[PDB]
Structure 1
Amino acid sequence: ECSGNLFTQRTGTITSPDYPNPYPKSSECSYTIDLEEGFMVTLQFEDIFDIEDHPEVPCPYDYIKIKAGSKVWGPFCGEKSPEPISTQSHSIQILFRSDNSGENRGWRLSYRA
């Protein structure tokens, strides 16, 4: 269980459960950053980024996705660290799902506003 996190602080670091050890099977995590209008959240992935992937289909197993207003980033998976995101928003949703198998270390991000 890792759904429904809510952060109103302007700074923080967020990780997949158990990072940098493997994240649980069948994860459904969500993290909302809820700041006053006018703040603009910037996000960066840090350290090891390792989400299961597939060699032909884009992120069909596990992934992180970020939403702010109508804008979506991701899904992201694999071993490449996503590029930094300047959301231009005060209200951000970070979603992570995993399927029922595999072994991958997960992700770490920091945010600021």
Structure 2
Amino acid sequence: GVNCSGDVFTALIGEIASPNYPKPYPENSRCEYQIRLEKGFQVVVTLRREDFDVEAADSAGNCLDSLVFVAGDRQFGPYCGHGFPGPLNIETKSNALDIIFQTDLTGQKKGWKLRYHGDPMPCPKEDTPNSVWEPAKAKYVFRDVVQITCLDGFEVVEGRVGATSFYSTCQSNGKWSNSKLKCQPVD
């Protein structure tokens, strides 16, 4: 095959296709594409069913040509056959993804074209005991900032002395900064 290795993708949106797409991919391909987003994002892969045609699996269900996505410990695929067999949207749960495409000596098809985007990872909303959150949202994600205001008769301890409100940021690790700070009754 050709050189289809070494490319690194770091933008929050991107598009990748097998060599020569939509003309037949090369035999004996060993392609690898690396997506590298900053911590706090997951790579989400979108691949339309009809944008994928790869040599069919053998009798034993094994892929001779294959597309595989590697995200840390997790693997998606191997995929082969006529039409993409996986979900239209794949949340890999990782900021780093390796896309690996290998082909054998015979039997080539049009190949594949995929897109990806970075999806900011969520920070779960705590139960707001004696406080209200601003803004109120169904989902908070990486870099969101909220103001947490204590109800009347409550205050923040461990923050400033005598605070009745504070801010908190959804961090790259899925946790709120200032998660130690709680609204508690006035003494």
Instruction: State the TM-score, normalizing by the size of structure 2.
Output: 0.58
Q: Which of these residues, 2, 7, 10, is aligned with residue 8 of structure 1?
A: 10
Q: Do structure 1's residue 96 and structure 2's residue 108 form an aligned pair?
A: no
Aligned to 1:68: 71
| Distance in 1 separating the partners of 2:62 and 2:111 | 14
Displacement of 1:57 after TM fit? Answer: 2.3
Q: Secondary structure at 2:6's aligned position in 1?
A: strand
Q: Any stretches of 5+ residues in structure 1 without a counterpart? A: none
| Distance in 2 separating the partners of 1:6 and 1:58 | 31
Aligned to 2:112: 107
Compute the RMSD of aligned alpha carbons.
1.2
Displacement of 1:80 after TM fit? Answer: 2.6
One-letter amino acid of the counterpart of residue 38, structure 1: G
Aligned to 1:38: 40
- Identity in percent: 39
Q: Any stretches of 5+ residues in structure 2 without a counterpart? A: 119-187
CA offset digits 1:79-110 (Å, max 9, x no partner): 13121210111000000000111130101110
Instruction: State the TM-score, normalizing by the size of structure 1.
Output: 0.93
| Distance in 1 separating the partners of 2:12 and 2:62 | 30
Q: Do structure 1's residue 58 and structure 2's residue 61 form an aligned pair?
A: yes
| Distance in 2 separating the partners of 1:51 and 1:40 | 26
| Distance in 2 separating the partners of 1:19 and 1:59 | 23
Displacement of 1:52 after TM fit? Answer: 0.3
CA offset digits 1:24-61 (Å, max 9, x no partner): 01101000101111111110113421000234222431
Displacement of 1:5 after TM fit? Answer: 1.3
Alignment coverage as a number of residue pairs: 113
